[PDB]
Amino acid sequence: AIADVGTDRYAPYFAYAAAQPSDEVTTVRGLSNPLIKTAPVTLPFDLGQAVADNCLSLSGMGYYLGLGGCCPTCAAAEPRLGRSDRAALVLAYVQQLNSIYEYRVFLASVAARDPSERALEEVLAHPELFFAYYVLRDGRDVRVLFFEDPDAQGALMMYVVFPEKSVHVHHRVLDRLLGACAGHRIVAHVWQTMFVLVVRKKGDDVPAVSASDIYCKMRDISFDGELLLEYKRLYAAFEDFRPPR
């Protein structure tokens, strides 16, 4: 009697649910409204902890991991990202790895830091970093910074610096971001008021990338002068950053 209760208040319903199956279906389907629609997080935050319908929101109000289906900022973009065809999206950035001319923002970062072909070889060696940039461009005005990974084998890590003081990564966008960068860890940070996603290796069908051919195209291209200086200032600001392992 003392161990039994406790609480035995479900027993009347389950007797009734056996007799009434058409009620049992509507009761189960009825339980659709989630009680917690957004929850706070702290930086540094591993994006791998977010599931397919989670969106990230970073601001002065705080950092939040919300449900996409109840999020107004996700709803506004939901018609724009409505296709969501991953067979085409995986083939898209695989195809766009071949031609990197339009993507000034990506190459400019290399041009500003170290404009040699050996630096361009080291960047093109990790094609998942371009995929990260391609995904985050679509769903706009991000900046990329390549640094050396001091707590790993001789390979580089990318910082994705956001322009605005308020940031919102759509659920479909970070679903694509995490899928495209399998074998890279993505963590969200803040540094000198700038939100930033560090993309480094943690532990694939890609075309063979000609480092010399793009290096030839680099000389023909005329970059925006104010964008290259921006990178030099941004590289200077992120030198003492030291993101934890």
Partner: protein, 168 residues
């Protein structure tokens, strides 16, 4: 007999189920196996089926479901008692995400669920707040989220509990 009910419960979603239990003497072995193929986004009503297993048994028990990544689909293994060594998710009511790599597994029993429910200040009144598993199968991983779900109209749920209370 329970599988008939379990299929009815999951008939709204697209989760495949696999086809005896004694109410006086409930078995320690696996009772049901729900499967969910790659690409799907279906929801498993965990708290409902756990509390369904408690009512099914006339002897005291602590029902448990095990969620596993086979490396192709998701697997939900039903039990009346949590087996020795079987895993439990450390999740809270607000922080409830669990990612599973290939062959890895987690689970949840009714007793550990009650601890989480009381610790989060969640409404214990019948069918007002019910834990359910949102699962997304993004190969090679399986993404799980142990979210509490309430009804769209609470006044409808309260009148249903009166209909059950009437027939008694």
């Amino acid at each position: 007999t329970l599988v008939q009910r379990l299929k009815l419960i999951l008939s709204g979603g697209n989760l495949r189920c696999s086809d005896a239990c004694d109410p006086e003497r409930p078995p320690t072995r696996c009772v049901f196996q729900v499967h969910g193929q790659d690409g799907s986004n279906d929801t498993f009503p965990l708290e409902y089926v756990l509390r369904l297993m408690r009512s099914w048994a006339h002897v005291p028990c602590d029902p448990y479901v095990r969620v596993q990544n086979t490396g192709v689909s998701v697997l939900f293994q039903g039990f009346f008692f949590r087996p020795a060594d079987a895993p439990l998710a450390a999740i809270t009511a607000e922080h409830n995400n669990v990612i599973l790599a290939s062959t890895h597994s987690t689970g949840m029993s009714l007793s550990a669920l009650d601890d989480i429910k009381r610790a989060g200040g969640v409404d214990t009144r019948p069918l007002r707040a019910m834990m359910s598993v949102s699962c997304f199968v993004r190969m090679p991983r399986v993404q799980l989220s142990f979210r509490f779900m309430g009804p769209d109209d609470a006044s409808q749920t309260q009148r249903l509990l009166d209909r059950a209370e009437m027939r008694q």
